[PDB]
Design a binder for this molecule. Sequence first.
Ligand SMILES: *C(=N)[C@H]1CN(c2ccc(C(F)(F)F)nc2)C(=O)N1c1cncc2ccccc12
Ligand SMILES: *C(=N)[C@H]1CN(c2ccc(C(F)(F)F)nc2)C(=O)N1c1cncc2ccccc12
Lengths: 306, 306
Amino acid sequence: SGFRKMAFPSGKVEGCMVQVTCGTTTLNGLWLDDVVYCPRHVICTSEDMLNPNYEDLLIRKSNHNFLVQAGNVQLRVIGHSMQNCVLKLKVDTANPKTPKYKFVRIQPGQTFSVLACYNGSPSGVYQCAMRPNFTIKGSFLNGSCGSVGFNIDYDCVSFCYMHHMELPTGVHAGTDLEGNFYGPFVDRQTAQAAGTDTTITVNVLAWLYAAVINGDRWFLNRFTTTLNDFNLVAMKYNYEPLTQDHVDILGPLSAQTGIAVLDMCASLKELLQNGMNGRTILGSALLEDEFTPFDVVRQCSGVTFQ
Amino acid sequence: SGFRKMAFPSGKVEGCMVQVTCGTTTLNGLWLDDVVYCPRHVICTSEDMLNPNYEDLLIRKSNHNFLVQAGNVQLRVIGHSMQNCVLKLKVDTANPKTPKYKFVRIQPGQTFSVLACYNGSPSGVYQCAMRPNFTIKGSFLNGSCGSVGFNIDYDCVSFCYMHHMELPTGVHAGTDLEGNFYGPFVDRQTAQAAGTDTTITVNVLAWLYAAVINGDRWFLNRFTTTLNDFNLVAMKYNYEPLTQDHVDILGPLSAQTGIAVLDMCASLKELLQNGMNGRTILGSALLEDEFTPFDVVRQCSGVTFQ
Ligand SMILES: *C(=N)[C@H]1CN(c2ccc(C(F)(F)F)nc2)C(=O)N1c1cncc2ccccc12
Ligand SMILES: *C(=N)[C@H]1CN(c2ccc(C(F)(F)F)nc2)C(=O)N1c1cncc2ccccc12
C-alpha cells in the first residue's frame, strides 16, 4: 500500500557525472565512453550570453580551456565539437563506469528522473514530467546546468534530458542528449515565453486509478461519458484532450480496478466542475498530473531493474 | 528555483541489496562486509506469524535453509544469528561494493531516503519522514520487506531504517539496523494501533521558509507571537509543540529570508485558524511537514556528496 513520487535508482547515472569548467563557469557534464556532454553555453562569458554566436565562440576555444574533472581525476580533453546546443568534449579515457545506454527524445506528458548535480557531484534525485508546454518544474540552483534526466528500462539507461536554463519565469528548460531543445527555447539570455501550460489528462486519470487501488475512492460516481463529451468539459478547464490512444493505455488499470476508463472520466468531469469539497486524494488536495499510467503500474505492481 | 521532494542518490545503497529466501518467503537483505541483514520474520511460516517464538523457530533453521542471492551470484551462508528483530546471515564473501557506513537511530520528525526493492533489486527511491507516532507513509508492496532507509553525510551512508511490516491500517513500520522497532510495534501478525499522528511543526515552518525563498509568500502577515502563545494554538490543531531547540534550528532560514522565526510562527498560526482560502503554497493546497530545516537548507543551497 501507499503511493509516492518515486524516482529510478540513480546509481548507473552517478558514475557518469563530471565537472566541466570554462573560465569562471563551472557546470556538470555526462561522461559516456570517451565523450563528455554538457551545455554549449559553458563557453559563454557574461557579455556573450545576450546574443552568442556559438560557432564563432567555439572556434576561439582551445582544448585546454576545458577543465574536466571526475572526482580527484583530471580528464584531458582531446577534442571539442558542437551538436546543436550540446558540447561534446572527447577525452583520452573512456569511463570505466559507462552503463548500457540510449539517447531518447520523450513526449510531452512523459516522466523521468532528474539527478541534480553541482560541481559534478550528485545532490539528489527526483521525478519530473515534461510539461505539455515543454518546460519542467524542477529544483535547480546555479551550477546545476548539465544535470540529466533519465529512465531505466530493464538494464538500459535512456537519457532523455539535459538541463540548460532557468527562464526569467522560474521554470526550467533543456535539450535531449543530441542537443535539441524541448519547446521553442534558445540558449541565449533573452525573455522567452513558454506556452500556456495544460494539465496532462491521461496522467490525472492514472493517478485516480492509483487512488482507487489504494482504497481512496470517494470521488467515484455512477455515471459514464463519451470521449467527446468529456473532452468538451476538459478544454474548459485547460486539460489536454483525451484520445483513444490514452484510453487504450489506461486499459490495465481499468482491469485491475473494475472501473471502465470512461467511468473514471465521468468521475474526473465532476471533480473539475464541483471541486473536491475540502477532501483529499492520496494525501493531496489538488489533482496530480505528473504520474503516467506506466508509473502507476510500475509502482502498484513492483517493476524492478538490473 | 523550485522545490521538490528530493531523495539522496541511491548508488552506494544499490550495491548492497540482495535477495533472501526462506521456504516460500522471499524478501530483501542488506549485504555489508560479510553480513546480510534482513527481517527475522523471513523464517516464519504462515502459521508461525500469529504468535512466533523466534528463538525456537531460529533454532530449527539450518544455514542451507537461507538462500541468499546477489545478481547471478549465490552467497553461501556460514552462520545465522538474531539481533533483536533483525536476522544476521554471515556469508563467506565480503561485499566488494561495501561503502563507508554507520547505523543510526533517527528521531521522530527526521527524514530519510527509502530504496524500495523486490527480489533484491532496486525499484525506486523516495524521501520519507519518521512520523511522530513512529510510522512511515511509504510505498511498499509484498516482497518489499528488507528495503532500507538512509541518509548520506559527506561520504558515509547512515542506515536508519529497515522495512518490516504493513499494518492492517495501511501504514508502515520497521526497525533500526540493530533490529529495534521504531514505535510500539512487534513483528507478529496481530492488530497494532499506532498513536495519534501529529504534524511536525518545525518541518512545516521550514517548508514555509522554502516557499518564501522561492517567491511564494502571500501567507506572511505583520504579526509576531510568543512561543507559548503559538503552542497554545498549535495543540488545538494536533501540531507538535515547538521548542527553543526548534527555533534555534530554523535560524539559518530566518537569516536568509529576513523573517524572524516567531514571525513565521505568527503566519502559521493564522493559516491554521483561517485555512488557505483556496490558494496554494509551493504547488500544494495543504501544509507540508515532511521537509526538515536541513532538507530545505540542503536543497536551497546545494549540498552534495562524495
Ligand atoms: C546553470 N548552470 C545556470 C547557467 N544558466 C545559463 C547560462 C547561460 C545561458 C545562455 F543564455 F545560453 F547563455 N543561459 C542560462 C542557467 O540558466 N543556469 C541555471 C539553471 N537552473 C537553475 C538556475 C538557478 C539559478 C541560477 C542559474 C540557474
Ligand atoms: C514484506 N515482505 C511483507 C511481509 N510482511 C510481514 C511478514 C511477517 C510478519 C510477522 F508478523 F512478523 F510475522 N509481519 C509482516 C509484511 O508486512 N510485508 C509487507 C510490507 N510492506 C508492504 C506490504 C504490502 C502488501 C503485503 C505485504 C507487505
